[PDB]
Amino acid sequence: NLPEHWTDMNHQLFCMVQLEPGQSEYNTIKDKFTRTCSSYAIEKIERIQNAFLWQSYQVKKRQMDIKNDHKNNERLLFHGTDADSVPYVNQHGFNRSCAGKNAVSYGKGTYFAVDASYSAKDTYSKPDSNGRKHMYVVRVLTGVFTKGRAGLVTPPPKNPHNPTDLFDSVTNNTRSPKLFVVFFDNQAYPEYLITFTA
Amino acid sequence: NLPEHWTDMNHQLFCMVQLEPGQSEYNTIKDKFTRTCSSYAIEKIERIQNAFLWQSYQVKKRQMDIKNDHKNNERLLFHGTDADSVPYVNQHGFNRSCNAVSYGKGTYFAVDASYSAKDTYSKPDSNGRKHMYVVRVLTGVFTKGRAGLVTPPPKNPHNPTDLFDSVTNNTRSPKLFVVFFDNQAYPEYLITFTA
Ligand SMILES: O=C1N=NC(=O)c2cc(OCc3cccc(Br)c3)ccc21
């Protein structure tokens, strides 16, 4: 069920595809980034074609679309990371067990930002030895969310008398969400890698 | 693609089905337990019919069968748990974020029911009832674990992203397996028993 606009991968399971400025695909990601990161400049944007991560993510999306009934369950969010983590994330996606404690913790999970400006902080997108910073653009199954708390290892129950029926994600603020935390594998697909510099 | 031996769920996606004693499915699961736990009393065995967990597990199985270029990635293993964790596991399966973790920070599965039957794992409830899962685990290609692992090690440190599927206490004669990812383990049966 691989998307028809992906490059042919020749029975291979992984490929990074360099995008061309002037194409709508490149320009919409550039605009989404520059909305809050006008001071930085983009070196390049790569489409991540990971067949296995895509399959698992799409199975979780279809399950959450069934479970939630007519919710927009998916948001396009940002995740800054260090150069050392980029090969693992490209192949294996986002592992909560590898996640750094956030300066404002709303739970022990993987953090995704609404604003590129947040992920552009040196604390998340650490400049490598050549001054390159790295930010993923990520399909995240935010589903139905509530304000998190520092102690969470899973999203909280919607109802305390039904502890197993969980929120899909948590946020910093349900009125004005600026970040989302997810606690399960295959709940985020890294779709694009932005390489950028000051 | 819901298995043959599952019974009708009336268009629902989750059911716990009590097995009939004396029929093949019950007898098969009873014998796997009684191989090392003949001194315990089985109160009941339930088949876990969780369509979402099953689907995510079968996708991983298909992926691991392609990656390893053969089948034989699956083992039937035991997991003891406290009564309060049973509803979570039935619905969401096994969560590494939730005892000793000497071979890594993953979910632990025993080759022998007798290991899972220890009170430290299958903690007796108020009434003395103990709980153990029979689990389909995608052990795949495994190596020896060690303390502090958050994922299995690489097969070759010249390709750090190509990983073993699981780790064990002992590669020649394993008695436990640790997996580090959601949906590498399907809880298939729950055994309620006493000492
Ligand atoms: O069935 C289980 N249910 N919950 C567990 O945490 C568990 C853990 C487990 O190995 C833990 C361990 C660690 C180091 C040395 C030795 Br020896 C054993 C085996 C079975 C189980």
From Swiss-Prot, chain A:
Domain annotation PARP catalytic: ranges: 2-198
Sorted alphabetically, the keyword list is: Glycosyltransferase, NAD, Nucleotidyltransferase, Nucleus, Repeat, Transcription, Transcription regulation, Transferase
A GO molecular-function term, please? NAD+ poly-ADP-ribosyltransferase activity
Q: Where in the cell is it found?
A: Nucleus
Chief place of localization:
nucleus
Q: Which GO terms of type biological process are on file?
A: negative regulation of gene expression; negative regulation of transcription by RNA polymerase II; protein poly-ADP-ribosylation
GO CC annotation: what is one? nucleus
Which first-to-last residue range defines the signal peptide? none
Q: What does this protein do?
A: Mono-ADP-ribosyltransferase that mediates mono-ADP-ribosylation of target proteins. Acts as a negative regulator of transcription.
Q: Which family does it belong to?
A: Belongs to the ARTD/PARP family.
Q: What is this protein called?
A: Protein mono-ADP-ribosyltransferase PARP15
Q: Which organism is it from?
A: Homo sapiens (Human)
What lineage does UniProt assign to this protein's organism?
Eukaryota, Metazoa, Chordata, Craniata, Vertebrata
